[PDB]
Design a protein around this ligand. Structure first.
Ligand SMILES: *[C@@H]1O[C@H](CO)[C@@H](O[C@@H]2O[C@H](CO)[C@@H](O[C@@H]3O[C@H](CO)[C@@H](O)[C@H](O)[C@@H]3O)[C@H](O)[C@H]2NC(C)=O)[C@H](O)[C@H]1NC(C)=O
Ligand SMILES: *[C@@H]1O[C@H](CO)[C@@H](O[C@@H]2O[C@H](CO)[C@@H](O)[C@H](O)[C@H]2NC(C)=O)[C@H](O)[C@H]1NC(C)=O
Ligand SMILES: *[C@@H]1O[C@H](CO)[C@@H](O[C@@H]2O[C@H](CO)[C@@H](O)[C@H](O)[C@H]2NC(C)=O)[C@H](O)[C@H]1NC(C)=O
Ligand SMILES: *[C@@H]1O[C@H](CO)[C@@H](O)[C@H](O)[C@H]1NC(C)=O
Lengths: 323, 175, 323, 171, 323, 171
């Protein structure tokens, strides 16, 4: 009669690497490396991304005539741009502190577009109907941004402009405006009449007097003139004043919003889907059951640590010796 | 390896014992067959699950954006940020890889001790009553029925009970 | 007769966590995570911090009427500013490279206030007695910052000013000055007479012409005007030169200083004491020894690493099995 | 757990052994009680203290400020700074947490190995002279007084002296 | 007859430290820490660094008379600049976005100087010959930057200049220019006649109007006036235009480049040699053979990780017990 | 050590055994000397060489410049850059330092393991045909010639060949 002590062997073909040997066959093992992604840009913690289609942050926020703008969402976990997203600032110029603005707008918890300075009532002594450009074509016609108003002289007269907005919204108001820098003395005259002009904009925190720099720049989108883009966040009870004698691309629409802690912008051709995730990758969402992932180094969420590993197999069983 | 049992004194595995990691094979007048040692198998699943969770549980992590966008005149901060991304990457890749190699060795070394302690536990019970024939086997100097066999497996072997029969058989073999 | 082999068992209740088993009662153990602090703000590098009370760095450097200064050291290891510190730039405007100055003033090994431009001698053609405001009150009276003189016209004349300081101190001199931006043409005329004015500040390292922006900004502390704040460190032997036809809020007091290694500003309500420590936390100081800590991420000194662990215990003794 | 001695073949610990970490328990003719094994307990203490000082003393570190201050238009550098802070936190937490787990398991195994080695050493000196009765105990076939007992512990045990004295005690 | 199973001992003196004890002599052990370097500056990715000699990047990129010049197509892996490199901006002033330029030039895949605005034909109405200074001497004479022309009035006349350039190259072109700020109104007339001047510079991405700041700065290198240095990277399709009524320090030489995957600048007196490396340190080059290094924390290449340790030798053999 | 062999029952090492890490000291009727256990030595060499290569080869790292230049008005960024370098310096130094300490200890135990294992392998072959005399020594009850000696080494030892011959000498 015999009693033999032994150990389990099986059908297992999986291998782990040890400090002493590389290909050791194990009876049981666990993978610690998340190597798979769902190929979709999901809602991050039940909140869907703000998918900007063919538009970029500048395009969407300025209300580029090629961008929807009247179909956003009161909240977004992150923003999505596509690598081809061309529609932005159609009138050439610099969009000052742009990446900073993109950063601030990456995540939002309350967001309402409202007419800060409504078109039909705000500008009784200035022309608010002209001030469309070949720089911004839309549906065959000379167009302009939806969120701004390019004020121009009211037939030979551009009187002094002075208009303010308080803030009865109980959150910060994002106000964007533009400074027009004409090409020539003739272009200044044709738009504003007044030759030596200035724009002043101020809040309790913001203060800048702008002076248009008339000069022919190399033609960009039929323009030798330039338009610089500006923005400020006006605190829950602060006032913003707009003073000008010419060259003011005036705010028409502004945004009441609550900035959400901290997100990002995914630039990707990855389609958006009605799925939830704890971790988002620019190329698909990932499970967070595992400590590591090799999908993408740039993730948004409560995410596993990116590693350049191809395999992280941790043995559970023993050496499989079916001999 | 480390404890000499697995791939040492016990040459190979058993595809016949499908109910556990460690156990026994027997032969008697009634029949043969494999059985798993429950006490050791369970404790080991318990502990290995603990180790598996620990490697995964302790991670936790923050809600982070990772990406940062910088303009054409912000290359230095843009490179600083890549340094942060790349440095963490090298830390996490090296540690993950080393942790796994070292812990896989420690796991197998653990299965070796479990199988070695199992051999030793029985050797301690049977004493003079069985012959250690190698390959992790014992050849009983007495008649060991399914009951007797079960007593050993359950760690309640009665040495004085089988003593006389084992002493006469041993003394005859040794004769 | 018997001789046994065995191990120690005790009264110990302490548990450790192992890789294979969660709650393990051990005979002996050492703690690797520091969770204790003294609740006091201590002397780092044998030097006490610079506690600012109700003042913030802006208010303290500029001689804000509520800040006193001088008798508040010549050397400090770090700056203590309280979270409620309101008293800063009483007259509204922008403090240029403010956080940069904050970092630079954080630790100083030599600090000496000196009248760069004695009030008495320096200004024979401008008024140095009028330059007070309702924005900066002291004991219920129009006052101003101690370290600055707000020059104003002398009986309907603001001659061009030109003043230089050549650094004869053995160290760097921190010079602070201001550009006043009036709200109206009249305010500009009543203060400076000149109307089309400028401010020029020159050094070997520094050069900037300032052109005042005259506009009605929203009222901040009854001020429709703004005062931008500027600073620069004048290297030893270097000349600093001021030139103006109005809008210059001259330096009166400059600071010869020695910037120390690498410290910061602790913003805390926690009290400052006569305790000597090597590691400081906003919450209190840690008397190190250990490699880990869960007190605070933000710390100054030769500190333990901040970990999110609530328990880190090394078993030294064996598994306690009393019976 | 690992060497199958502590909580293995030696089921439990002795509260009666205040003396040190690993020792003996004699029961002869002249009084019974416990006494630690110094030439192992001191070694263990010295080695374990070294392990502790290493985990502690390998840290060191330099004087740093950590906290950074940034204006309203410096959010990206504010956020980059938080990434560094969180990245280091996650690194250190996970590392500290795992080393603590991994190492606690290593220390306990060391104690198990030390007890196993102490039991094995005695069994080797004794041989036929004393019967292995499980749970770390040896039942002497011969008569071993308080001096003889001290010797087995000392590493000085003459097998021939009690050879025939114990041989004619196997029945 | 006897058979004893035993282990090895040898003449080895290598001592390692283990968790359980310090200084253990082993039979065999390997070092893991790179403690040595070649004390030479080497090629990286098979490319030699650009050594700046007695110059720094500013002196190099502008045409500082004391600087080398690369009239031909080149490429570097990194930039070497000696700690004693004095030859930079010979005429005093600010080099706008200087550290940004430094980084962008750190490693270049292709670099080629060309005469953007040839000296002989570009300015028939302004003086290209005059525009030499005592501040920029060369072989004991009034000189200037090689890559720039200090254009000046042509016999009591300075007409409006308009000069544009279309990037016919198929790679970015780095353009540099200067704005001269004279000390007196006499200086502004003596050099430019015009008195109320501006400088306008534009591309598709760039646009700036410059206005001379006339003032007496403290005398640096015999100069009371200042020169500011600006640069831009013109894209392939793009055109860069210059407009001025005075004060323009015109480009003469510009540089076509392909910016290489980001590198760095070593400030070292270590001599450059025809060696190759994967890792470069200011002190000299290291082998990326071992995982850790204690040479220098600032490295360029695929490097071992910097470490404070003086020794990291891993045991491989067993304890050495001679007996 | 951990397994009781190296600096335990096998008191010290052999300088006369240059051929390998582990082995035997044969001493019989036809000359004596030292010989390395080919299998156990070679196996150990291979495994150790892998352990070494794992520590060095899992490193890798990508192209980095590290060095960063800032102006006088960029001290906070200068300091953020320093916090990153020192952070990584604190991590690598402590980790490398601990990885060497912890791993040197696991290596010496591994050697102790191969010696203990080899000891028991021979013991299991000879069962009662040889006496255990300490220092890891077996004294043969029979006449183990060079071919008999070269059977215990390669693990082909024939217990029935000497069984009864050894049985007689024992008495
Ligand atoms: C919104 O998105 C599209 C995509 O970028 C913009 O359209 C593109 O605009 C460029 C620049 O004006 C066009 O170039 C032109 O090509 C024509 C041929 O019709 C040529 O003869 C012209 O002289 C000129 O160089 C390009 O054709 C066109 N590309 C696409 C894909 O549509 C569009 O302008 C954007 N609109 C707004 C309002 O932002
Ligand atoms: C989106 O992400 C995950 C998907 O599983 C969810 O996270 C869990 O949240 C529950 C309660 O909401 C917790 O008790 C779990 O422990 C979480 N686990 C993980 C792995 O994150 C989350 O709830 C999801 N949101 C929605 C709207 O379903
Ligand atoms: C110092 O800070 C105090 C903080 O409150 C300021 O006082 C507040 O400011 C306005 C104008 O004085 C008052 O109407 C509030 O009620 C004030 N509170 C108190 C308690 O006085 C004060 O303005 C600051 N002084 C300076 C010189 O900056
Ligand atoms: C070059 O450097 C030396 C050392 O500072 C100096 O004497 C010389 O005048 C410099 N010349 C130029 C043109 O930079």
């Amino acid at each position: 009669d015999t009693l033999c002590i032994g150990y389990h062997a099986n059908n297992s073909t999986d291998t782990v690497d040890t400090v002493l040997e590389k290909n050791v066959t194990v009876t049981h093992s666990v993978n610690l490396l998340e190597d798979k992604h769902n190929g979709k840009l999901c809602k991050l913690r039940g909140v869907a991304p703000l998918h900007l289609g063919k538009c970029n942050i500048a395009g969407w926020i300025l209300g580029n005539p090629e961008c929807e703008s009247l179909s956003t969402a009161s909240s977004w976990s992150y923003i999505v741009e596509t690598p081809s997203s061309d529609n932005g600032t159609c009138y050439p110029g610099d969009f000052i502190d742009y990446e900073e603005l993109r950063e601030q707008l990456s995540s939002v918890s309350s967001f309402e577009r409202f007419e800060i300075f409504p078109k039909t009532s705000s500008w009784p002594n200035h022309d608010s109907n002209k001030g469309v450009t070949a720089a911004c074509p839309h549906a065959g016609a000379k167009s302009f941004y939806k969120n701004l108003i390019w004020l121009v002289k009211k037939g030979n007269s551009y009187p002094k402009l002075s208009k303010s907005y308080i803030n009865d919204k109980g959150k910060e108001v994002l106000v964007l405006w533009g400074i027009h820098h004409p090409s020539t003395s003739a272009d200044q005259q044709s738009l504003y009449q007044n030759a030596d002009t200035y724009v002043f904009v101020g809040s309790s925190r913001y203060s800048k007097k702008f002076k248009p720099e008339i000069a022919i720049r190399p033609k960009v989108r039929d323009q030798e003139g330039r338009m610089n883009y500006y923005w400020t966040l006006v605190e829950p009870g602060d006032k913003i004043t707009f003073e000008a004698t010419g060259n003011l691309v005036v705010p028409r629409y502004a945004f009441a919003m609550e900035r959400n802690a901290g997100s990002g912008i995914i630039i990707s051709d990855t389609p958006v889907h009605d799925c939830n995730t704890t971790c988002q990758t620019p190329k698909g969402a990932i499970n967070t059951s595992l400590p590591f992932q090799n999908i993408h180094p740039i993730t948004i969420g409560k995410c596993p640590k990116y590693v350049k590993s191809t395999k992280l197999r941790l043995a559970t069983g023993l050496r499989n010796i079916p001999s | 390896g480390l404890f000499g049992a697995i791939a040492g004194f016990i040459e190979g595995g058993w595809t016949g014992m499908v109910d556990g990691w460690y156990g026994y094979h027997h032969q008697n007048e009634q029949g043969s067959g494999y059985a798993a040692d429950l006490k050791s198998t369970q404790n080991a699943i318990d502990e290995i699950t603990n180790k598996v969770n620990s490697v995964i549980e302790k991670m936790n992590t923050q809600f982070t954006a990772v990406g940062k966008e910088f303009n054409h005149l912000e290359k230095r901060i843009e490179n600083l940020n890549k340094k942060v991304d790349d440095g963490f990457l090298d830390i996490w890749t090296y540690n993950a890889e080393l942790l796994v190699l070292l812990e896989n060795e420690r796991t197998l070394d653990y299965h070796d001790s479990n199988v070695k302690n199992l051999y030793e536990k029985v050797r301690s019970q049977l004493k003079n009553n069985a012959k250690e024939i190698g390959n992790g086997c014992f050849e009983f100097y007495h008649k060991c029925d399914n009951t007797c066999m079960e007593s050993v497996k359950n760690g309640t072997y009665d040495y004085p009970k089988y003593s006389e029969e084992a002493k006469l058989n041993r003394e005859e073999i040794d004769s």
